[PDB]
């Protein structure tokens, strides 16, 4: 009790995506866009797919550093493209200045930046299972009211710096309330965004020799 | 013995066309022959009525909709017949394909008023396992004790009103766990009947 509740079952912020600001060699981007996705790792997916409707706001932390763990003074910009704003397309792009997209200007050699995204959804709660077609085969069960936004990350620079920056996005679920519990997924996850499984069914329980043996 | 899903009768959203016993009648769909080789069936929540009587006129010629249901399954079985059904209502029942082609056919996600026979009832056709399907609202049909199962389902969705021809809230599955058996000289196909009765329905956005 109080440790099996739904509020605690989804605590303990975990890594939801490892994005990388490729800036050296044959990938002189200097920026990167990471579409906010909760069901990125199977471990978190299977837990989130226990309920049908869920309502929660998230706190995002960015543990960024170079590829040899050193944290120089390089400045970074974390821009939060809201759900329904055009995303940037280059290191030097007008979108990086739009005052409607909140930005966080922190350096590599600083405590990881930590923001708090609110509950951004048209409906009352997020819908992991949406039986039906949107836009009244490649569309069944795709709810568009689950998009939380985009996190665009760039090094504030003029020319290519020559240093790849690996970022580890950490998300914490707060104020969570879940609805309509569901059976936990038993088969594998053959593809993302779909419940598609494989032909060769895998029995939930392990198979023993005889029914009367322990 | 009416399993009131989640302990909530369907109610009118406080203050839209609110129909009456003309639409709140008892739609008795076609029967389905339950055989030994039978795997199961499932009917979507409002898709099973979108082409049946008045409810098929109020749903297609509108834009918003919300209603509960009174699904009621009965099996006209003899006393020398044995078997068991699992009648469960699955909110947001999302069907999944089975790759050895990636997305479910439209006939399998909106079967109509005839239902679609399961191709792999062990996994509920949705990845999740049938063994845990009892976490949903359900009622057993065990031919040795009773052959009736009534489920009262409220309106379960995120938005108050939603479309009726695109988003099908739940799906009434009927799966035989213990297969049917009988000695020679009996009705080799137990019939299964399903009765639907929309409760506290509403509509909006005419034509």
């Amino acid at each position, epitope marked *: 009790v109080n440790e099996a509740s739904v509020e605690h079952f989804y605590s303990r912020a975990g890594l939801v995506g490892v994005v990388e600001v490729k800036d050296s060699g044959t990938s002189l981007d200097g920026y990167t866009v990471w579409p906010i996705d909760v069901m990125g790792f199977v471990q978190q997916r299977r837990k989130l797919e226990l309920s049908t409707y869920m309502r929660f706001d998230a706190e995002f932390t960015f543990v960024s550093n170079l590829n040899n763990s050193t944290t120089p003074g390089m400045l970074l910009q974390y821009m939060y493209v809201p759900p329904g704003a055009p995303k940037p397309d280059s290191r030097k792009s007008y979108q990086w200045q739009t005052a409607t997209n909140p930005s966080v200007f922190a350096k590599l050699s600083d405590p990881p930046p930590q923001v708090s995204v609110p509950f951004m959804s048209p409906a009352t709660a997020y819908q992991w299972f949406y039986d039906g077609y949107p836009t009244f085969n490649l569309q069944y069960g795709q709810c568009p009211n689950n998009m939380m936004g985009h996190f665009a990350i760039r090094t504030v620079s003029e020319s290519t710096t020559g240093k790849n920056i690996h970022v580890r996005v950490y998300m914490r679920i707060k104020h969570v309330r879940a609805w309509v519990p569901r059976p936990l997924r038993s088969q594998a996850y053959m593809v993302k965004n779909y419940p598609t499984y494989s032909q060769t069914i895998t029995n939930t329980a392990t*198979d023993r*020799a*005889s*029914i009367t043996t322990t | 013995n009416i399993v009131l899903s989640y302990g909530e009768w369907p109610e009118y959203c406080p203050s839209p066309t609110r129909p009456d016993v003309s639409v709140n009648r008892f739609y008795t769909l076609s029967t389905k022959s339950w*055989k*030994t*080789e*039978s795997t199961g069936w499932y009917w979507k929540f409002p898709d099973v009525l979108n082409d049946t009587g008045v409810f098929g006129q109020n749903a297609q010629f509108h834009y918003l909709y919300r209603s509960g249901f009174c699904m009621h399954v009965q099996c006209n079985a003899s006393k020398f017949h044995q078997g068991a059904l699992l009648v469960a209502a699955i909110p947001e029942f999302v069907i999944a394909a089975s790759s050895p082609g990636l997305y479910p056919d439209f006939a399998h996600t909106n079967p109509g008023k005839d239902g679609q026979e399961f191709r792999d009832p062990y996994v509920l056709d949705a990845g999740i396992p049938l063994s845990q399907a009892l976490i949903f609202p359900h009622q057993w049909i065990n031919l040795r004790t009773n052959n009736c199962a009534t489920i009262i389902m409220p309106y379960i969705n995120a938005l108050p009103f939603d479309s009726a021809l695109n988003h099908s809230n739940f799906g009434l599955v009927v799966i035989p766990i*213990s*297969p*049917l*058996k*009988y*000695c*020679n*000289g*009996a009705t*080799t196909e137990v019939p299964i009947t399903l009765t639907i009765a929309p409760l506290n329905s509403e509509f909006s956005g005419l034509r």
Partner: antibody, heavy 120, light 106 residues
Framework: EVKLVESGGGLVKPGGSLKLSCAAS????????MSWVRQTPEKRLEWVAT????????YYPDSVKGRFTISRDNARNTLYLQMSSLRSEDTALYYC?????????????????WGQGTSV | DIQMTQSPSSLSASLGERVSLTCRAS??????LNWLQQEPDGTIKRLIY???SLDSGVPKRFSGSRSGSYYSLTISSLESEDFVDYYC?????????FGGGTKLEI
């Protein structure tokens, strides 16, 4: 009793068709999942084909897998098995018996009672 | 296929002896191995189902047993009407293969 009887076999030129009947009675031939077993001249019983308990599902081994076509009358109490373009080394005493991977309450009558076996 | 096969291709014993015919499976087949007795020219009757239990009519002289991957059949004292063929059948491996034969002599 589970009285099954096979009949309808005989000689045939390599390449054609030759069905087979397993009309059985004395038991409910509407709930049991039957199957076909072949006893080659080398006295080695090999699985031929199977059929579900309602004639809807079918597992074809690598022996035919596209050539043999099983069926089930289920009303005239008969069991069919096609021999479409049988191969050269395909002569055997095609027995028929019960048993099937379908019919969840199975694994008990797996080829419990057999027929008689007609040659080809 | 799992290819469960019987080791004695042909055996010969006395009318009071205790034959021990085996059927060595390759993969894990569980307790889903049957024994089918075939007449010299007639149909094939069943002896054991699920490797342990006699059928509804089989005598007491027959009995099944399991030992790891060495599913076997042992007759009590080899009375008359026994010098016929024997088969072992498993229904775990979906190809549903068979064994060889244990035609007994004397």
């Amino acid at each position: 009793e589970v009285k099954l009887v096979e009949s309808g076999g005989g000689l045939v030129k390599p390449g054609g068709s030759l069905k087979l009947s397993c009309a059985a009675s004395g038991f409910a031939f509407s709930t049991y999942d039957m199957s076909w077993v072949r006893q080659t001249p080398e006295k080695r019983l090999e699985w031929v084909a199977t059929i579900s308990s309602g004639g809807s599902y079918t597992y074809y081994p690598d022996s035919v897998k596209g050539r043999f076509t099983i069926s089930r009358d289920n009303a005239r109490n008969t069991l069919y098995l096609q021999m479409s373009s049988l191969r050269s080394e395909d002569t055997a005493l095609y027995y028929c018996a019960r048993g099937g991977p379908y019919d969840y309450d199975g694994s008990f009558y797996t080829m419990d009672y057999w027929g008689q076996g007609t040659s080809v | 296929d799992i290819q469960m096969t019987q080791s004695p291709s042909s055996l010969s014993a006395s009318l009071g002896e205790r034959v021990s015919l085996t059927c060595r499976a390759s993969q894990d087949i569980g307790s889903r191995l049957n024994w089918l007795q075939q007449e010299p020219d007639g149909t094939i009757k069943r002896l054991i189902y699920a490797t342990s239990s006699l059928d509804s009519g089989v005598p007491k002289r027959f009995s099944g047993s399991r030992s790891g991957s060495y599913y076997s059949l042992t007759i009590s004292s080899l009375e008359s009407e026994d010098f016929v063929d024997y088969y072992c059948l498993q229904y775990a491996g979906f190809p549903w293969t068979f064994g060889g034969g244990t035609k007994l002599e004397i």
